[PDB]
């Protein structure tokens, strides 16, 4: 569950919110790409343990299960950090925390009548084709 890289950078700031400043390590998004030669080598190496490219229903359902598992793991990590903050083992950030609050605000809010009707319409429209 997750990529094997985590790129970190050094940031020196004043923190704005009246807190002591330190070297720390700011985070930068990381992703694993490849070039033509490395891609060819990888494809040759993993030609015996590679899943077929194409959305076979088996692989789609497995991916969805994997995404549910990843969501559960991320939520568990967030909950553990929240428990640590509440118990005081770790400091209340005062930042990023309100990022979690924004996440909780962005919840879909299903069971609204209009959305329910639209979603039923879409489900029936797909089921007729099925």
């Amino acid at each position: 569950l997750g990529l094997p890289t985590e790129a970190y950078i050094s940031v020196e700031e004043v923190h704005d919110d009246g807190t002591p400043t330190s070297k720390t390590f700011e985070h930068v998004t990381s992703e694993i790409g490849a070039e033509e030669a490395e891609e060819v080598g990888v494809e040759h190496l993993l030609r015996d343990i590679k899943d077929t490219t194409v959305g076979t229903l088996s692989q789609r359902i497995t991916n969805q299960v994997h995404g549910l598992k990843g969501l559960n793991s991320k939520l568990l990590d967030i909950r553990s950090y929240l428990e640590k903050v509440a118990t005081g083992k770790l400091p209340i950030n005062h930042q990023i925390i309100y990022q979690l609050q924004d996440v909780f605000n962005l919840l879909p809010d299903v069971s609204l009548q209009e959305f329910v009707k639209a979603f039923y319409l879409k489900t029936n429209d797909q089921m007729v084709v099925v």
Partner: protein, 175 residues
């Protein structure tokens, strides 16, 4: 029934069959009522009074001629008939209380008593106690809690997910 071919048949046989029909009608076992009624030859369906009375009363109950049932209660040819006629009257009263329950959305005590055929408000109060009909602020029994409109707001989500996963299973199954 089994030994009609030798044993003689008495008018007491009609009387007992009619009593059985009345018992079945009173116990609301209408399906069993008709199942038993099929046994009797069609000739005695209308000829014999003992079975005609239960059949007539059941027919009246079929088309909601409940006042007809109450008025015809006096056609009883035997006291044993009268006992089960009282039981049938009680059953019809329960069914009428329902009738006000499910169809109507609200009712009033003054008109509800007439609908349920109660000559004393104490009987309707007992029904409110025995059947627990919620009284209204303006003395209007409320049945709105019965019909309701559930399941029209929340998507099942999980059940249809199971159904779609079943579709995928039946698709990718090798067999």
């Amino acid at each position: 029934f089994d030994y009609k071919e030798q044993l003689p048949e008495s008018a007491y046989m009609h009387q007992l069959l009619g009593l059985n029909l009345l018992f079945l009608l009173s116990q609301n076992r209408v399906a069993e009522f008709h199942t038993e009624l099929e046994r009797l030859p069609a000739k005695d369906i209308q000829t014999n009074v003992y079975i005609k009375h239960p059949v007539s009363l059941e027919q009246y109950l079929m088309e909601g001629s409940y006042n007809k049932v109450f008025l015809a209660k006096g056609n009883i040819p035997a006291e044993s008939y009268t006992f089960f006629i009282d039981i049938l009257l009680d059953t019809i009263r329960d069914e009428i209380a329902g009738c006000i329950e499910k169809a109507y959305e609200k009712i009033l005590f003054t008109e509800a008593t007439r609908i349920l055929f109660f000559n004393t408000p104490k009987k309707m109060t007992d029904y409110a106690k025995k059947r627990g009909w919620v009284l209204g602020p303006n003395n209007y029994y409320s049945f709105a809690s019965q019909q309701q409109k559930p399941e029209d707001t929340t998507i099942p989500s999980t059940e249809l997910a199971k159904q779609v996963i079943e579709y995928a299973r039946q698709l990718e199954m090798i067999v």
